[model samples]
Target: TPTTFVHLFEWNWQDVAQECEQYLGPKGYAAVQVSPPNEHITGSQWWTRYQPVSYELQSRGGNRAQFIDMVNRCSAAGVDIYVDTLINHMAAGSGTGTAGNSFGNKSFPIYSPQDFHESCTINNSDYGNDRYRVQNCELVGLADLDTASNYVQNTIAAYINDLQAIGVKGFRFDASKHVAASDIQSLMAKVNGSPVVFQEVIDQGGEAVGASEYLSTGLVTEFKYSTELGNTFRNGSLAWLSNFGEGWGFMPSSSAVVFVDNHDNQRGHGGAGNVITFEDGRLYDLANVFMLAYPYGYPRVMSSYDFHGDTDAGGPNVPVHNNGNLECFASNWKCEHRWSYIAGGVDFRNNTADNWAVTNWWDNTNNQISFGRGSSGHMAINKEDSTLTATVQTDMASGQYCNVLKGELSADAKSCSGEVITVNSDGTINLNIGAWDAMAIHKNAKLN
Candidate 1:
């Protein structure tokens, strides 16, 4: 099975190249989702990238050379790049794009003014039942693309096919709900290769477009998963998640792409619900670990730059761009992907790659939960204010085990860098999970 896919949101091309080689490859990430590489409306604010001015693969991300190089280098490292295809519309309002291209909605080359939907912004009334206007109207103030136009469809297809030729392996169709399903099917038919795709279908509440409506094309971003998971975790219903599935208002495991939080929800935008972010601290870590541990969907970790809780936060403060390789440490960037707790879950997911059953399930019926991933791995999470001490079924061989959540496996995978665990011959361990804490041990970390 493929490993985790990290959303390296807004990282410069050169930095992404290095990240694929230096970090992502070594850490076992199969892919990295990048910011929209296409030429976009000019602005340092992040949303500018979402409004495309042309098909040119040039913008704040990097010029043509840098983007191509990043794709090739990351591909060589076993980390493929998935471009964020902003195919829904051209630049909204009027302004010059980042590539020094001045464009009105009518000024762009690839799309003419006649190719756009009528200037109508989507409103509350156009949801739940008005599927036509919901797919045809502007999301925000941006002009919506008339996706069915043969000229528009061909142009969009050529753009994605060209990116695929440039070594992109997949795409995250931005504002996919705005485009009719038939348009996506027709356009996807023209893509170069069988690239993986996941459409952003935020069906949190009353919305005409249900997430299941788009499953035929590829995976649909399960936005409801995060919101419900966040609420359950915060409200002490962690025990119920043992059966996390359609019961949680989510699609089947095969057709879903899941995450604890995403770019927009982290800072509150695009159907902002009670989602988790780095600001939530421990619960954020717990949620990600749980998401990774569970076998539900293709998981993607959100590695974001820091932002104040606002509607329009700009790109990461690239303080000193030394040789174009930016270091998003304790600077203005959030860098949630590099957190020890979340990083540990990557290995947990990778180790439990094969099909596994949820055996040895255990929970406190309130805020604690643990289960064995069919001997591939075992984990215990405690969300209560007090430490949890119990004899739990670890389902590992008789040996000393290491907690991957707060530590590392030893050279021989026998011991660890943090708390030590000893499993008895009958596959049980005296586990002690701390307050709002998590403990995980996998088969790869077995000891004598």
Candidate 2:
């Protein structure tokens, strides 16, 4: 299993390449979900990327060559690429063309004003009504395509095929709830099964059209699970996280993409409310630790460039060159991927590779949790004001254990004690954890 997926949200391709080289590649991130790479409307608005103008790999991210280079570099470093494909609509109502090239010409007529497709207009024909309306008609006046048509399918397939040929491993289908399931399946079949296609079907519990339909074709984004996890964690109930499989009505583990928070929700894009984020530092740490510690659905972590809660904002303040290359912002955009607890949790996931099971379960009434993985690894977390003490198990008989959070540990098999403790034993041993801190211990771990 991969360690984690990071949504390198709103980053241009060049910056993404720098990040992969500087951080993600070294940190054991298996893949990255980049913003849509296609040519999109030319606007400073965040939604402009969602309103795609064409399938040409030219957008806020660099042009085609830069995109290909980033993919190859990241892949070479053992990180896969997942593109966000916005195939549901085009830049019709936006009026502004992408890449300073007006689509009003004949080649891009689908987005041009000269000749709108028969299935144009927001409300006019069968193609303009209800589900068909969402799929074939305009979204907020964007040009919705007749994806069922062979012409449109070929056009989309060509773009997706190019991505696959460039070694992109997967895709995140945006606004899939608006498109027909059959159409989505057809598109998937055309990609030659190269990409692991997952659709963003945001059915917030009440809708009859659940994510199940899309699961048969590919994994569906488990947006509801995000809400459930946030609610359970904020309510100070760690046990609720234990019941995190089919019992929670989420798509089976194999077919679900899970995350604590996403780009859209963090900035209040798609009807956001009551979500925990880096804004809630302490809770975020606890939530992320549990997310990595517990085995559940395929996990994806949000690596956001900080913003001031502005939904329509761009990336952190960066200087852009004439060709759209962004220089680093000197003093903004807190990259959460660099945080100690979050990054350490990711490291822990890498270290404990195949080990999965909650042995030596230990936690106090005050907000702290601890568990051992097989006989090789153990972890502890304490978020309360007061100190915590408990018994934790380990594999070794009576030897020294390295405290992952602090520095060193030396304890015996049957019994052990410390303000923050670890025991090298096959059975339970006495343990104590500190306030507002976390610790992990590994037997035979070398000190550096």
Candidate 3:
């Protein structure tokens, strides 16, 4: 399986298609998790996409033809498109949808009043103990679907088939925590093929509807991975991450989709707090480096646009695409995924896939740490106020290696644009890692 994916949040189909051909496929990205392509209420807020109006492939992202073309183009580039499928609810009020379809009073062209749950508002208390209310009640006034009904199942199944027929390889079922597991299984059985399946179950513990309930259907989003990792990177010690996976009460590595910060939590929605985002600058890069380098669940890189002031505003003007790379920092598109360190982390992960086990581990018992991925890759991170000088042991063979944390290797694989480290034949490497910096060297990046 491909090692990682990127969430091209709010990117239109054309931009996404271009990204796949230019950066993602070449960088070895497994897939692109896109925004909901279905028709939605006309609004500038990114949340508008979550408030789905209808199943038509028409929205701020793009229309049906463009979406299909994007899927085909991305597939051609060896990158899969995973739709953000929202089956839990519909628009909360009357409005003309992006598809030009008029909707109102909990009614859509494909759904009626009977297709919804009884009008019961969800309270903050419901999340703690009232499983029934949490799952069936309205979320912030959006009309919750009556997922138990065969009518709803058939409607969603048809929608999935529509996407699958056009080469969509996977789905992130938005708000999966709000629907019953049996309902998800029913909808899954009705689909034509088993494309990649994962659920958006925000389980940070002490929740009535835990992520484990949705596990039987597919991989569940590990929200704790985000918040806890964020806390550690922001306030705690880096040495504490030596055993950051299941030892920390996270889901099994194989059953979870992990990220440093996602679109929702980054904007103070759904399990927000202590999360590191694009606003954190180098800290964000270091966090992502640890996320991608550490052996954990599938890592997702967050590619976002600047929404510094009004969190609800739409994407800024068309993002600037400069040659093969999106103009970073200056443009509205933050493109954290394209950052040199993050992209280097991606390459490091791909090159070290065969050896997932950690070896040659060393730590200062504080903020400085280094470890090896068996003999395939080795990395060191220094988060202290001063530089870390050490002779770390590794399993890698002796060679000059590109320090991917500084930047990625050139296309020809014969040169590196960043600093290079020389590992001695006895598996010892001298390092002068900077404060708040990291270094990763993999076998594939070893020079002759």
RMSD in order of candidates: 1.9, 5.4, 1.5
- Lowest-sum lDDT 10-residue window in model 3: 319-328
Each prediction's TM-score versus the true structure? 0.95, 0.84, 0.97
Q: For candidate 2, which ten residues in a row score worst on lDDT?
A: 409-418
Higher-ranked by lDDT: 2 or 3? 3
All candidates in order of TM-score, best leading: 3, 1, 2
Backbone atom clashes (below 3 Å) for every candidate:
4, 1, 0
**Model 2 alpha-carbon miss at residue 155, Å:** 1.2
- Regions more than 4 Å wrong, model 1: 271-273, 319-331
Better of 1 and 2 by lDDT: 1
**Which candidate tops lDDT?**
3
Q: For model 2, how does the per-residue alpha-carbon lDDT over 1-448 read when each residue is reduced to its tens digit?
A: 3668888778778777777877788777888999988888887766778877777788887788999999988888888999998867666543445566556432363433323344544543332234545455555666666667676777788888888989899888888876778988787777766567788987666553557878777888888777877877666555455456677877787788877888887767543566667777767766777676666667788876556656687776562222454333223544666666676566666666667666666555436677767765677777677776666655534544455444322343332232334353455555565666776654434332
Candidate 1, residues 254-325, lDDT tens digits: the string is 889888888888776653556887778888999999998988888999887666665577766663245665
